[PDB]
Amino acid sequence: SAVFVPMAFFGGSTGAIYRQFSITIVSAMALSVLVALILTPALCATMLKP
């Protein structure tokens, strides 16, 4: 997030366009972490074979 949230900071229509990506992947990634942090351990703990 510290590499690409800054790219939301470009002004102009250039940055207008950069905004979409810049945030869309931080959103996608941050939840990606929160879900991987909640769901995946659960699902690992329960569905894997010993």
Partner: protein, 394 residues
Amino acid sequence: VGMAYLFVRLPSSFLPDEDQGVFMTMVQLPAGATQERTQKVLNEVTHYYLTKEKNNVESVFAVNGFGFAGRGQNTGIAFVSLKDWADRPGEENKVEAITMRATRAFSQIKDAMVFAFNLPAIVEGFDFELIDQAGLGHEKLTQARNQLLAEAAKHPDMLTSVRPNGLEDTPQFKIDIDQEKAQALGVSINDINTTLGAAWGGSYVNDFIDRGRVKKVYVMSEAKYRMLPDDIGDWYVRAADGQMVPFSAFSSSRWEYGSPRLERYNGLPSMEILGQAAPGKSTGEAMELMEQLASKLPTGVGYDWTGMSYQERLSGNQAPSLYAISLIVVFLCLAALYESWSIPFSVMLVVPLGVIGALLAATFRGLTNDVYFQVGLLTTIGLSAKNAILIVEF
């Protein structure tokens, strides 16, 4: 340093100019050009599409009289649909090529500017203005631009194509109403000027109802009686003694030139200019040369940038600043877990390792440093960051 070089050499676009399945064509005729002639040219273009690119074009919709520069008899435009992408595989069957061939053919058409293009990935190079600051007047600003464009021409290296966006001065017909005569013959100047206008320009009288719906009532001369300069005299106006007078009696005419499409920029007279940086060269330098080319012109003439040119002023490159803050907020935010001095730096070294492939894989498929390549970079570095992080952390 391989990265630094391969980076600094790679070209930079905005977005890919994609096959939008549709495109557009420009038909622009010379001075004093008439509707009929334009209609000819439009038919030549339409012909091309319908006959020669049967395989691609799906339908041409073309209009005489609706310029995108703006209206005229001497302007037309063809909206082109294409056949589906499925039903035309191959570059040769893709928009860019189609436009190329199209243009190539239309170049053959004498006595017209016709070319065809795709509308850029932004549905809604430079745009340079030239302002009449000190009130020098249209023919002097004409001269100012003539001098500027034909002195720019002397820099093929620096600037590739410097053209005016407007229409050029064109013949127009001056009538001078002898006031003294008008008064002598007892014919009112209102009656005169109205007669002229209504006959030749047309006049909106009042409204009528046409099948339940209000529309205009226009009075105007039959075509044949307003098609030529000598037709001017044929019109009579009634004087106070009930006696008819011809326009010849109290008018006088002569030909002159003048612009059929004046312009102003921020309330002051201006004339607009288009051009772009020559192959290999940055917009910024092209603009700088134009900036100093302007300085050697008559006094009262100044300049301003608009639109895209105006934008590139606010900022064009902040990447080295905001990637710098990206680099520090990254230098420290990693240590916010490694709780270590300089340990993040180790992960940091790997950042160029990733971008090398990205950079070359663009350069070999001949692609460009664009928004997509940028966001690409961010994702790739972030991934190789993850991989290196997990290694050093373990």
